[PDB]
Amino acid sequence: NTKRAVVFAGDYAYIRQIETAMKSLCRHNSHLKIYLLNQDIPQEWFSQIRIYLQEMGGDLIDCKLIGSQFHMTFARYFIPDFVTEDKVLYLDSDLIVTGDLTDLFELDLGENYLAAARSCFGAGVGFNAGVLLINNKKWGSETIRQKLIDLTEKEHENVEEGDQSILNMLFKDQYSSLEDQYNFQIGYDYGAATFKHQFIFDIPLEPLPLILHYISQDKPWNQFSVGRLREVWWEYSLMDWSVILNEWFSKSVKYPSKSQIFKLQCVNLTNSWCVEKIDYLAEQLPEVHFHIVAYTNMANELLALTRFPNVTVYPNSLPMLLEQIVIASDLYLDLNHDRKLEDAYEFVLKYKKPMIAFDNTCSENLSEISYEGIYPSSIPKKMVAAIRSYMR
């Protein structure tokens, strides 16, 4: 069985909507490789949900939009910067999946950049951007991300529907059509009643369309709403993940969780952005939990480390808090480049913690043999091996 690639985009403030949309998707579709573009979603949320996805034969990818090369609704531009599959389904998070999307996953795009449903049953112009079957390979080569940004830079003050207006203005005459049921814009109800489009309300709702899109500001999760099918959103919002997993498990669709308990706890205190080879070490040592502490604001280079499931980053901490982390750690990593904060060494000595360093990060005021080991920064494989020697 092969994985089907799906991408959502949203901030932590929208977590209840993102999670509800994912729950509805996973309820009816297994083997999903889900990418989630975000800036501020907590790592703990990703860790747990990732286990669910894996147990259902899929995975969950934390795509952190942290850095200058990068919300609101514009994050879908950066899709080909994260997704490795040649085809992927983008979904808004103000929507609900009600059934098997196999036919949608398997649609052949040909030379079309994407496939999409029309806007509001044909009331609007062009396609609705909330459901996009995307030719990711083509998006990569045609440099679509830069083209959307550049075009949105012009004429964002000249368009009625933002990113959607931009997507239609770039892509017209080169997209495939999806049936309305794959992006059924039930959120248009207020609009339809406004413009007196009586026949919109004669469109059958039994059985439920495969994808329900609650467009507009009349969201069913608000205290009050006026559009139809409000009850469907709540049905999935209030659904335990256990219900979803139990349905798949009861049909023998069960895969082992790939999560593992940590075998070692490492700590470093930095005041600078550059912790030597930290990204590489994190990548190579998923079974080590790294704790990177600072007493001040942190640069994007360090904040972006949240994309790893095994790095905890503590900006704006204080000496008493660092001390407790040191006591709890197995090994100090002297990897920071600027002037050393001595008391960390004091904590290290006091609590009898081993400490290792790179050739270019060892203190100028310390003797070599004060470290358990000093390893070459241009061959960090050697420190990887060094770190693993502390485990058992």
Q: What track of x and - describes contact with ligand UDP for positions 236 through 275 (by CB under 6 A)? A: ----------------------------------------
Instruction: Identify the bridge partners of residue 90 per DSSP, sorted by sequence position.
Output: 7, 132
Stretch that binds its own copies, among 9-17, 129-137, 166-174, 365-373 (CB under 8 A): 9-17
The string of DSSP letters for 85-110 reads SSEEEEE-SSEEE-S--HHHHT---T
- The residue behind tokens 């207020």 is 190
Q: Is 257 in the site for its own copies (CB under 8 A)?
A: no
Query: Among its own copies, Mn ion, ligand UDP, none, what does residue 192 contact (CB within 5–8 Å per kind)?
Result: its own copies
Q: Say how many C-beta atoms besides its own lie within 10 A of residue 215's C-beta.
A: 24
Stretch that binds ligand UDP, among 9-17, 39-47, 290-298, 373-381 (CB under 6 A): 9-17
Q: Which amino acid is at 98?
A: T
Q: Two tokens at 87?
A: 């085809």
Q: Which is nearer to ligand UDP, 237 or 272 (CB)?
A: 237
335-359 in b/e burial notation, b at 16+ Cβ within 10 A?
bbeeebbeebbebbeeeebebbbbe
Q: Say how many C-beta atoms besides its own lie within 10 A of residue 51's C-beta.
A: 16
Check: CB of residue 120 under 8 Å from CB of residue 201. Answer: no
Distance separating alpha carbons of residues 383 and 184, to the nearest angstrom: 54
Q: Which is nearer to Mn ion, 55 or 163 (CB)?
A: 163
Question: Using the rule CB under 6 A, which residue among 54, 176, 216, 265 binds ligand UDP?
Answer: 216
Q: Is 391 in the site for its own copies (CB under 8 A)?
A: no
Q: Is 215 in the site for ligand UDP (CB under 6 A)?
A: yes
- The least CB distance from residue 80 to ligand UDP, in Å, is 18
Q: Which of residues 120-149 bind ligand UDP (CB under 6 A)?
A: 130
Q: Is 227 in the site for ligand UDP (CB under 6 A)?
A: no
Q: Is 189 in the site for its own copies (CB under 8 A)?
A: yes
Angle at 121 between CA 117 and CA 123, to 5 degrees: 115
Stretch that binds ligand UDP, among 4-12, 27-35, 230-238, 282-290 (CB under 6 A): 4-12
Phi, psi for residue 207 in degrees, rounded to 5:
-75, 165
Question: Using the rule CB under 8 A, which residue among 173, 206, 240, 364 binds its own copies?
Answer: 240
Q: Which of residues 54-83 bind ligand UDP (CB under 6 A)?
A: 72-73
Cα distances (Å, whole numbers) of residue 139 to 71, 85, 105, 129, 136: 20, 11, 18, 15, 5
Residues in contact with ligand UDP, total (CB under 6 A)? 13
> Helices 230-237 and 15-28 sit at what angle, rounded to 10 degrees?
90
Instruction: Identify the bridge partners of residue 346 per DSSP, sorted by sequence position.
Output: none
Q: Is 318 in the site for its own copies (CB under 8 A)?
A: yes
| Paired sense of beta strands 131-135 and 211-213, if any | unpaired
Question: Using the rule CB under 5 A, which residue among 19, 55, 94, 276 binds Mn ion?
Answer: 94
Interacting residues with its own copies (CB under 8 A): 12, 15-16, 40-42, 44-45, 48, 189-190, 192-194, 196, 198, 201, 221-224, 226-228, 230-231, 234, 237-238, 240-243, 306, 313-321, 323-324
Interacting residues with ligand UDP (CB under 6 A): 9-11, 13-14, 72-73, 92-94, 130, 215-216
